[PDB]
RNA sequence: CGGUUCGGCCGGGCACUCUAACGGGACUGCCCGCGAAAGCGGGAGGAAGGAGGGGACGACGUCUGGUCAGCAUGGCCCUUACGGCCUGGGCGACACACGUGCUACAAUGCCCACUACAAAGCGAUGCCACCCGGCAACGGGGAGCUAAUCGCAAAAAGGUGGGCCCAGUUCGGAUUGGGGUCUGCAACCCGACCCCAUGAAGCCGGAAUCGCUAGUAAUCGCGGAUCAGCCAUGCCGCGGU
């Protein structure tokens, strides 16, 4: 892959709510590959917010970007003898998609039960910093300092 | 192991098959197997005839077959003797009521199945060797025959390895459906070591 | 109440030979059966290009199948003793079933 | 008499003898209202009907065959245009805005020479 | 080729039981095809050669 | 841990101890390698020794063709050692 | 449900409690309920001794099984182990005695699970 | 476990010999080459000896050894 | 439109369903910025694009690699014999090293009920609808099949509710004795399959390492091929998604 960068196909937006950002992560949430499974694991996840949380799920707009907006990232660069991951300028471009990364791991390595339970016990875990999302998220941010000089140098 | 038999593809599309007939079912295991049984013999039977195209019309229990031969009606005998013998020979093996059709082979120069024979014949009791190369590449252009790319196998009269012969002219490609070539098997019975023939030259376009 | 059936490979001569005889019946038959292609019972083969280690030779093969049927219950004189059993070429192995 | 459209979607056809009447339609004896229990996707089958605001104007015919039900529910957006735009030719202008009648040939690719799902290769160890 | 194993081919071998396809002229029960009677050995060549009534190669 | 095979000769406790003694000695090299296999051949011109090892970070290969059977085996493993050297780089 | 030997299944419906015993399965779980005219949707603890009697007699009226079969657990093979039995053999050897391999796919008896020194030079594939 | 419905295979190309020991007289030690045959009450408690393929094995049907297919008592394998 | 033992079973014809052949059909054929010009970028638009997706194809040539042990087949070695008929036995062993694959750590699942959907082949001494036994694995009378016209199969997963609430769990299922079927004058070795009991490693597994740019990977299932039989978690093909 070099001759062309191609042209991304805008994903088929949601149906029950009608919204791309919705079926967004859902596309990846789809383990193995079954558009019905994922299209079912939400008829409780959202109600979690509508329930436990004093607010309806709909109010959970850019809550993702919020808990998933570090200042560093993962990249690479050669010099002439060593190999050191060189992080730098972050763009909302990928932040949107990456904002759903932690959700995955934060939905696997868990000492609870089925998805439903995990969802609830994870949804609210998207504010202060309890769990793996914001936890690991802030860690990636500490990957600055002796990384932070890779800032003015933008290319 | 690369480069296959190009004519193969065309055999179903652009190259009338050899063992072409309509029968089906259980036949393919016994009946069809018998085809080779008969083949083994008939082939070795009159290889000297100078065949170049073993056509076969195995009509529903009334086979035909119409092989092409070098010598015209000469094969038929000094008037027509074994011709009949043949129509009753195959009957012993399989008296399946089968017509006997035969034809000749004009333009041998563009008939690899017949030229390839010449090769095997040059390995029966020693013939030309080094000069033998071009010795069999002149008749080519002698009647047109665009191209002169043909393969052999190995050894040169009794070498130690298995070299190959050069030559490469005329638009007789392979990576594209624009060649049309014909060639016939030609076992190389050698006193010191059997080899293989690969006479393939242009025949036509569309 | 007569049954027939055909078969062959190169349809170039099959569909050809087909009406070569079929058409030679309307002269006395009714609307007649008609051109019925029938499914192609494909035959896929595969030949290992080289035994002995290096499990990467193979490549496949194939063969076509094109049968016909016709079947004209209650034929018509000039169609029975007519074409009778004509079948010079080679490509089919008909069976005059019933 | 009246006309109609058929439908296709991943080797799944569906004849639909639309006929005058109220609007709703039964499925071989089980109208959607009493068959496909609010099956999320299934419902969408008549997206245009919702748009053109038709539906309650006719009474189709329902009997699907071939392919998978999922690839069967979509073999409707085809018959639609093959009907609504036939009987009603002028009803083509509002059809393009949707264009959902494009049966995406997205089908499970064919397995290769050992290749699991046409694009899935096992792992390797010490090399 | 030797023929130290065709005694079986003799009609019904043993108490009529032994029977395992094998190839026509190659003898290889472990890589043959009943319907054809030819192991993938002495059949692979003739395949593309042009000796199978309308049986081309597959590719797509 | 150490498998030696050959389609010409047999495996002797001396050839096993020879190669084996070199394995236990390759401590600095000890890091991966899972179930290694070594093969021994022979040609009119001498003997040949081939070896293959699978690791969690790739696979290594080595071969030898010295006139002396023992020299070939020693040479092959020499390449194993020389190969692991490049793995650590510098 | 302390009615025989170390049998104390409880804290749920009875239908469950049935198969919920080392000896009860399918043709013994609800199948017994029938023979005793009881619905599966019942409580276990609730069944006073009264109900327990039906089990104490009908149910307890089982053959050599679970709690009592503890007198043939090995006897079931005692007559096919020592003796020159294949199972010995697989008996004399206490290995699986019912059509299967021994190299692998029978690691139940022969070799527990402790990692054996894997072969080195003799195709391991 | 194992079964055959009925007619448990009994090598009879030897049964005639094995039954000689009980047809008009008695005798011990007979040779054999099998491991398929089954034993029947009629002929039990006798000195026998069968093969394996290349090896011979001691045989003597007793009450403690239900005379079945036999082979399930001395297959072939050997190790340490 | 008439019928309708409501089940396409009748009368019936051309749409239409696929299927079976030919022709056309997509080369950007039209606008521009860029152009020095053979050309890179948005629109038309039709079923659809930019070599449409896909393979066969696989350049003369490298490794002087390997199948003479399976055909052909130089030579050399046996040449009462490295010729020959046979019953059995190792290749389903062992202190073991990992590859290749299957199936699981679950609660997404355990099971009860009903049901809408795919290609494909194949069943001549061959396959199975029905009849009844019957826990079934299974059987007997044998219809029918050389066949869009009978079977192989009421595809699986799935869908709606029901009962089940995190423990090594109605998870997974290696596993052992007693019984049954199908092939064989037979299934010890070394059969899968039906029942009775049965039930471990295992809460993602130090490292290390593999697959793909789309209908992908992934999850659940089916047939074919071979094979007399039998143990496909292998092989080729297809699909629900």
Q: What is the DSSP string of chain G?
A: --SSSS----SSBHHHHHHSSSS--STTTHHHHHHTT--SS-BTTTS-HHHHHHIIIIIT---S-TTTGGGTTTHHHHTTTSSS-EE--EETT----SS--SSSS-TTTSS-SS-----SSS---
D41 SS3 class = helix
CB contact under 8 A, F56 and D126: yes
Residue with tokens 């395949």: E47
Torsion angles phi and psi, residue D16, rounded to 5: -135, 90
Which 8-state DSSP code applies to residue A94?
H
Domains held by chain H: number: 1
- The whole-angstrom separation of Cα B46 and Cα B55 is 15
Measured in angstroms, the CA of F4 and the nearest CA of chain G are apart by 5
Measured in angstroms, the CA of E34 and the nearest CA of chain C are apart by 13
Measured in angstroms, the CA of D123 and the nearest CA of chain F are apart by 12
Q: Cα H71 to the chain's mean position, in Å?
A: 8
**For C41, how many CA atoms within 13 A lie in the half-sphere containing its CB?**
6
Structure tokens at A73: 């990232």
Is residue A25 a contact partner of residue A100, using CB atoms and an 8 Å limit?
Answer: yes
Q: C39: which nucleotide lies closest, measuring CA to C1'? A: I19
Q: How far is the CA of A36 from the C1' of I27 (A)?
A: 42
- The whole-angstrom separation of Cα B10 and Cα B204 is 13
Q: Which chains touch A (3 or more CB pairs under 8 A)?
A: D
Torsion angles phi and psi, residue B118, rounded to 5: -45, -40
Torsion angles phi and psi, residue C63, rounded to 5: -160, 135
Is residue C30 a contact partner of residue C80, using CB atoms and an 8 Å limit?
Answer: no
- Chain G CB contacts of F1 under 8 Å are 117-118, 120
Q: Which residues share a beta bridge with H50?
A: H57
- The whole-angstrom separation of Cα F27 and Cα B150 is 59
- Residue C59 CB partners (closer than 8 Å, separation 6+): B4, C46, C47, C49, E57
Q: What angle do CA A39, A44, A49 make, to 5 degrees?
A: 120
- Chain F CB contacts of G117 under 8 Å are 1
Range of the domain at H60: 1-80
Separation of first and last alpha carbons in chain C:
6
Torsion angles phi and psi, residue F81, rounded to 5: -60, -50
CB contact under 8 A, C10 and B16: yes
Question: Residue H2 belongs to what H/E stretch?
Answer: none
- Chain H CB contacts of G83 under 8 Å are 64-65
Structural biology method used: X-ray
- Residue F27: which region, alpha, beta or left (left: phi > 0; alpha: psi -120 to 50)? alpha
Q: H12: which nucleotide lies closest, measuring CA to C1'? A: I185
Which 8-state DSSP code applies to residue A8?
P
- Residue C50: which region, alpha, beta or left (left: phi > 0; alpha: psi -120 to 50)? beta
Structure tokens at D88: 């009603």
Structure tokens at B8: 């193969």
Domains held by chain E: number: 1
Structure tokens at B33: 């197997």
CB contact under 8 A, B60 and C95: yes
Q: What is the CATH number of the domain that holds H48?
A: 3.30.860.10
Look at residues B188, B185, B186, B184 and name the one whose alpha carbon lies nearest to residue B126.
Answer: B188
CATH 3.30.1140.32 intervals, chain B: 107-206
* Chain D interface includes F40 (CB < 8 A): no
CB contact under 8 A, F4 and G120: yes
Query: Pseudo-torsion of CA C76, C82, C83, C85, nearest 10°?
Result: 100
- The whole-angstrom separation of Cα B68 and Cα B103 is 5
- Chain C CB contacts of E56 under 8 Å are 61-64
Helix (H) and strand (E) counts in chain A: 7, 0
Torsion angles phi and psi, residue F54, rounded to 5: -105, 130
Which 8-state DSSP code applies to residue D44?
H
Is residue H3 a contact partner of residue H33, using CB atoms and an 8 Å limit?
Answer: no
CATH 3.30.300.20 intervals, chain B: 16-106
Could you give all domains of chain C from N- to C-terminal order, each with its CATH number? Answer: 1-98 (3.30.70.600)
Q: What is the DSSP string of chain B?
A: -----HHHHHTTSSS--SS-----GGGGTTHHHHHHHHHHHHHHHTGGG---EEE--EETTEE--EEEESSSGGGGTTTTSHHHHHHHHHHHH--S----EEEE-S-GGG-HHHHHHHHHHTTTTT---STHHHHTTHHHHHT--S----B--S-SSS-SS--------SS--SSSS---B------B--SS--B--B---B----
- The whole-angstrom separation of Cα B46 and Cα D121 is 54
Beta strand pairing status for C60-63 and C43-46?
antiparallel
Residue B69: exposure state from Cβ atoms within 10 A (0-12, 13-18, ≥19)? buried
Structure tokens at E21: 């396809």
The CB density around residue B22, as the number of other CB atoms within 10 Å, is: 27
Q: Which residues share a beta bridge with F6?
A: F40
Q: D120: which nucleotide lies closest, measuring CA to C1'? A: I211
> H/E/C letters for each residue in chain C?
CCCCCCCCCCHHHHHHHHHHHHCCCCCCCCCCCCCCCCCCCCEEEECCCCCCCCCCCCCEEEECCCCCCCCCCCCCCCCCCCCCCCCCCCCCCCCCCC
Look at residues B27, B198, B195 and name the one whose alpha carbon lies nearest to residue E49.
Answer: B198
Structure tokens at C74: 């209650």
Q: Which residues share a beta bridge with C44?
A: C62
* Chain C interface includes B22 (CB < 8 A): yes
Separation of first and last alpha carbons in chain A:
22
Measured in angstroms, the CA of D3 and the nearest CA of chain A are apart by 31
Indicate the residue of C10, C63, C93 with minimum beta-carbon distance to B61.
C93
> Longest C-alpha distance within chain A, in Å?
57
Nearest residue to nucleotide I92 when comparing alpha carbons to its C1'? G101
For the domain bounded by B16-106, which CATH number is listed? Answer: 3.30.300.20
* Chain E interface includes C74 (CB < 8 A): no
CB contact under 8 A, C87 and B62: yes
CB contact under 8 A, G89 and H73: yes
Measured in angstroms, the CA of E52 and the nearest CA of chain C are apart by 8
CA distances from G8 to A96, D64, G1, G32, G43 (A): 56, 55, 4, 18, 14
Could you give all domains of chain G from N- to C-terminal order, each with its CATH number? Answer: 1-71 (1.10.8.50), 72-118 (4.10.910.10)
CB contact under 8 A, E58 and C9: no
Is residue F72 a contact partner of residue F64, using CB atoms and an 8 Å limit?
Answer: yes
Structure tokens at D115: 């290749």
Range of the domain at E23: 1-60
The third-level CATH classification (topology) of the domain covering B107-206 is: Ribosomal protein S3 C-terminal domain (3.30.1140)
Nearest C-alpha in H relative to G85? H73
Burial profile B128-161: b = 16 or more Cβ within 10 angstroms, e = fewer:
eeeeeeeebbeebeeeebebbbbebeebeeeeee
Nearest residue to nucleotide I210 when comparing alpha carbons to its C1'? D123
Helix, strand and coil content of chain A, in percent to the nearest 5, comes to: 35, 0, 65
The CB density around residue C18, as the number of other CB atoms within 10 Å, is: 21
CA distances from G42 to B134, G2, G3, G55 (A): 101, 18, 18, 14
Nearest residue to nucleotide I241 when comparing alpha carbons to its C1'? A34
- Chain G CB contacts of H65 under 8 Å are 83-84
Question: Residue A121 belongs to what H/E stretch?
Answer: helix A115-123
Nearest C-alpha in D relative to F58? D127
Q: C46: which nucleotide lies closest, measuring CA to C1'? A: I236
Q: How far is the CA of D73 from the C1' of I221 (A)?
A: 21
- The whole-angstrom separation of Cα C79 and Cα G107 is 75
Measured in angstroms, the CA of B122 and the nearest CA of chain C are apart by 30
Beta strand pairing status for B101-104 and B66-69?
parallel
- The whole-angstrom separation of Cα G37 and Cα G14 is 13
Residue D40: exposure state from Cβ atoms within 10 A (0-12, 13-18, ≥19)? middle
- The whole-angstrom separation of Cα A29 and Cα A105 is 11
Q: What is the stated resolution of the deposited model, in angstroms?
A: 11.5
In terms of CATH architecture, what is D1-127? Answer: 2-Layer Sandwich (3.30)
Q: G115, G121, G124: best mutation site toward chain F, by most F Cβ within 10 Å?
A: G121
Q: How far is the CA of E41 from the C1' of I55 (A)?
A: 24
CA Rg value for chain G: 21
CA Rg value for chain D: 19
Domains held by chain A: number: 1
Indicate the residue of B27, B56, B59 with minimum beta-carbon distance to C87.
B59
Q: What is the CATH number of the domain that holds E35?
A: 4.10.830.10
Structure tokens at B35: 């085809």
Separation of first and last alpha carbons in chain D:
73
Which 8-state DSSP code applies to residue D88?
S
- The whole-angstrom separation of Cα A32 and Cα B117 is 61
Residue B5: exposure state from Cβ atoms within 10 A (0-12, 13-18, ≥19)? middle
Indicate the residue of E44, E48, E55 with minimum beta-carbon distance to C43.
E55
Total beta-carbon pairs less than 8 A apart between chain F and chain G: 22
Is residue G96 a contact partner of residue G109, using CB atoms and an 8 Å limit?
Answer: yes
């Amino acid at each position: 892959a070099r001759r062309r960068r191609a042209e991304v196909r805008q994903l088929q937006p949601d149906l029950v709510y009608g919204d791309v950002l919705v079926t967004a992560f859902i596309n990846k949430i789809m383990r193995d590959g079954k558009k019905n499974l994922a299209a079912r694991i939400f008829y409780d996840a959202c109600k979690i917010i509508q329930e436990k949380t004093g607010q309806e799920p709909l109010k959970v707009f850019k809550q993702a970007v919020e808990n998933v907006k570090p200042r560093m990232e993962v990249r690479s660069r050669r010099v002439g003898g060593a190999n050191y991951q060189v992080p730098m300028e972050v763009s909302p471009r990928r932040q949107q998609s990456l904002a759903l990364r932690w959700l995955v791991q934060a939905a696997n390595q868990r000492p609870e039960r089925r998805a439903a339970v995990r969802i609830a016990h994870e949804l609210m875990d998207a504010a202060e910093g309890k769990g793996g999302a914001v936890k690991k998220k802030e860690d990636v941010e500490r990957m600055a300092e002796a990384n932070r000089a890779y800032a003015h140098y933008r290319w | 192991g690369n480069k296959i038999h190009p004519i193969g593809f065309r055999l179903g599309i652009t190259r009338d098959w050899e063992s072409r007939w309509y029968a089906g079912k259980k036949q393919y295991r016994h009946l069809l197997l018998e085809d080779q049984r008969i083949r083994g013999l008939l082939e070795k039977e009159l290889y000297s005839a100078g065949l170049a195209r073993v056509d076969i019309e195995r009509a529903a229990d009334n086979v035909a077959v119409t092989v092409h031969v070098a010598k015209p009606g000469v094969v038929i005998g000094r008037g027509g003797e074994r011709i009949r013998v043949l129509r009753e020979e195959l009957a012993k093996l399989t008296g399946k009521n089968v017509a006997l059709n035969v034809q000749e082979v004009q333009n041998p120069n563009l008939s690899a199945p017949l030229v390839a024979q010449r090769v095997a014949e040059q390995i029966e009791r020693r013939f030309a060797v080094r000069r033998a190369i071009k010795q069999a590449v002149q008749r080519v252009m002698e009647s047109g025959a665009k191209g002169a790319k043909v393969i052999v196998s190995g050894r040169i009269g009794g070498a130690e390895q298995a070299r190959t012969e050069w030559a490469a002219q005329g638009r007789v490609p392979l990576h594209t459906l624009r060649a049309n070539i014909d060639y016939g098997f030609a076992l190389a019975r050698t006193t010191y070591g059997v080899l293989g023939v690969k006479a393939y030259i242009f025949l036509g376009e569309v | 109440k007569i049954r027939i059936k055909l078969r062959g490979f190169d349809h170039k001569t099959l569909d050809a030979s087909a009406q070569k005889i079929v058409e030679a019946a309307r002269r006395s038959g009714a609307q007649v059966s008609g051109p019925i292609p029938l499914p192609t019972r494909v035959r896929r083969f595969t030949v290992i290009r080289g035994p002995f280690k290096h499990k990467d030779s193979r490549e496949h093969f194939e063969l076509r199948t094109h049968n016909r049927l016709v079947d004209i219950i209650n034929p018509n004189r000039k169609t029975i003793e007519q074409l009778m059993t004509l079948d010079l070429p080679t490509g089919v192995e008909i069976e005059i079933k019933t | 008499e009246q006309y109609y459209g058929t439908g296709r979607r991943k080797e799944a056809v569906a004849r639909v003898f639309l006929r005058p009447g109220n609007g709703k339609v039964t499925v071989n004896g089980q109208d959607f209202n009493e068959y496909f229990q609010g099956l999320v996707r299934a419902v969408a089958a008549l997206e245009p009907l919702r748009a053109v605001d038709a539906l309650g104007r006719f009474d189709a015919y329902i009997t699907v065959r071939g392919g998978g039900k999922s690839g069967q529910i979509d073999a409707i957006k085809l018959g639609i245009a093959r009907a609504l735009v036939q009987y009603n030719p002028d009803y083509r202008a509002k059809l393009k805005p949707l264009g959902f009648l494009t049966r995406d040939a997205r089908v499970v690719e064919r397995k290769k020479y050992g290749k699991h799902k046409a694009r899935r290769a096992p792992q390797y160890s010490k090399r | 080729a030797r023929k130290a194993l065709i005694e079986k081919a003799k009609r019904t071998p043993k108490f009529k039981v032994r029977a395992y396809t094998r190839c026509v002229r190659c003898g290889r029960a472990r890589s043959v095809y009943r319907f054809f009677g030819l192991c993938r050995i002495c059949l692979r060549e003739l395949a593309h050669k042009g000796q199978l009534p309308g049986v081309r190669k597959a590719s797509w | 841990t150490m498998n030696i095979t050959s389609k010409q000769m047999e495996i002797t406790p001396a050839i096993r101890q020879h190669v084996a003694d070199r394995l236990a000695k390759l401590e600095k090299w000890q890091t991966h390698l899972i179930n290694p296999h070594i093969i021994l051949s022979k040609e009119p011109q001498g003997f040949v020794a081939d070896a293959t090892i699978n690791t969690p970070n790739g696979v290594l290969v080595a071969s030898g063709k010295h006139e002396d059977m023992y020299t070939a085996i020693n040479e092959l493993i020499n390449k194993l050692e020389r190969q692991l050297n490049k793995l650590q780089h510098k | 449900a302390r009615i025989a030997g170390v049998e104390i299944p409880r804290n749920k419906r009875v239908d469950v409690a049935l198969t919920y015993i080392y000896g009860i399965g399918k043709a013994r779980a609800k199948e017994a309920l029938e023979k005793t005219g009881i619905n599966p949707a019942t409580r276990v603890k609730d069944l006073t001794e009264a109900e327990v009697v039906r089990l104490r007699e009908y149910v307890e009226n089982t053959w050599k099984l679970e709690g009592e079969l503890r007198a043939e657990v090995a006897a079931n093979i005692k007559r096919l182990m020592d003796i020159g039995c294949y199972r010995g053999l697989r008996h004399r050897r206490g290995l699986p005695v019912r059509g299967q391999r021994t190299r692998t796919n029978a690691r139940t008896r022969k070799g527990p699970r402790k990692t054996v020194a894997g072969k080195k030079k003799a195709p391991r594939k | 476990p194992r079964s055959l419905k009925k007619g448990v295979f009994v090598d009879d190309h030897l049964l005639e010999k094995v039954l000689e020991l009980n047809a008009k007289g008695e005798k011990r030690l007979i040779k054999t080459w099998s491991r398929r045959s089954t034993i029947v009450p009629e002929m039990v408690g006798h000195t026998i000896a069968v093969y394996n393929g290349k090896q011979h094995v001691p045989v003597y049907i007793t009450e403690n050894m239900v005379g079945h297919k036999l082979g399930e008592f001395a297959p072939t394998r050997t190790y340490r």
